[PDB]
């Protein structure tokens, strides 16, 4: 968490991201489907 320059891009790697959001790639549909039901009815 240290930097010796005033330029913010000369620093090391920043804090960890820890998030992911897979619902935009796995299930990108309008009618949200459940698990325990038939997807086509």
């Amino acid at each position: 968490n240290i930097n010796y320059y005033k330029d913010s891009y000369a620093a090391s790697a920043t804090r960890q991201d820890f998030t992911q959001d897979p619902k935009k790639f796995t299930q990108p549909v309008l009618d949200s489907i459940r698990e325990l039901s038939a997807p086509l009815n």
């Binding site: 330029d7 891009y9 000369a10 090391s12 790697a13 920043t14 960890q16 991201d17 820890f18 998030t19 992911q20 959001d21 897979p22 619902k23 935009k24 790639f25 796995t26 299930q27 990108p28 549909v29 949200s32 489907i33 698990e35 325990l36 039901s37 038939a38 997807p39 086509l40």
Partner: protein, 284 residues
């Protein structure tokens, strides 16, 4: 009172996930109407059948790490992007900064369409027999539009405005940081378009796919001396992607590579993605 019709969200939700997912215990299902095994792949969605609804599972408190798989820890590993050959006795050498020429780091970067990163270059300069001779070098950075040097002792090496690095061969290798220098808001590796207007030809249009938002300049190198010393050099440039953001994933390359700027392949020799076996009805 006036004309009325002049008066007249998303789906995904990100969660901070630390470790891998757990498993809750299950039981047996003996009932009709509720089925988790039947899917429909035509809806464009993936299957959502979890393993608690297929079999009977136990309670597992999972403590595995999902840290090294992020896009920062995946790209912050410096690899070779260019080799500059300098034979002294024109006296200098240039290198158009294009990292699409070496294939270890190219294929990692072709997973995505748009990337926004900072870089961290490193220049490992040796002789042709191994290195370590006490001569002094100069590495200029020539932005697009700046005059490239035209001689071993020309006036463009005065370097009053653009950056430069003086380092000997016997020092540790020089290392700088480079910001996001594109005029757009992301480096795009695939540009389906033409740079200029006009009538585009049918035979050989060498401008299809040229993205001028990625051309970042020229890297020049000489030996800081008056009389021409006689020693052959090679530099090796190592780029480390840091502070990196990526958009719009795409499939990974499966065909062998051909040109730097163009995604060519040969159609007469298309390599299959899966190596062959004897028949379909046996596994080994």
């Amino acid at each position: 009172d006036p004309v009325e019709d002049i008066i007249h969200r998303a789906i995904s939700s990100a969660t901070n996930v630390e470790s891998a997912a757990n498993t809750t215990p299950s039981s047996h299902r003996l009932e009709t109407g509720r089925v988790p095994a039947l899917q429909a792949a035509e809806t464009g969605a993936t299957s959502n059948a979890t393993d608690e609804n297929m079999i009977e599972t136990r309670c597992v408190v999972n403590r595995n790490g999902v840290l090294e798989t992020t896009i920062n820890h995946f790209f912050s590993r410096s690899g070779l992007v260019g080799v500059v050959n300098l034979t002294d006795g024109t006296g200098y050498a240039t290198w158009d900064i294009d990292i699409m020429g070496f294939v270890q780091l190219r294929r990692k970067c072709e997973m995505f369409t748009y990337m926004r990163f900072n870089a961290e270059f490193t220049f490992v300069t040796t002789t042709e027999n191994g290195g370590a001779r006490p001569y002094m070098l100069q590495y200029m950075y020539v932005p697009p539009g700046a005059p490239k040097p035209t001689g071993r002792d020309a006036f463009q090496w005065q370097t009053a405005t653009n950056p430069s690095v003086f380092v000997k061969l016997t020092d540790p290798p020089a290392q700088v940081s480079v910001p996001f220098m594109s005029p757009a808001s992301a480096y795009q590796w695939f540009y389906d378009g033409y740079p200029t207007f006009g009538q585009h030809p049918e035979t050989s249009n060498t401008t299809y796919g040229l993205c001028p938002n990625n051309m970042m300049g020229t890297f020049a190198v000489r030996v800081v001396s008056r009389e021409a010393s006689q020693l052959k050099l090679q530099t090796r440039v190592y780029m480390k992607l840091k502070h990196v953001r990526a958009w719009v994933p795409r499939p990974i390359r499966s065909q062998p590579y051909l040109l730097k700027n163009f995604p060519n392949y040969d159609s007469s020799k298309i390599t299959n993605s899966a190596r062959d076996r004897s028949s379909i009805k046996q596994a080994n």
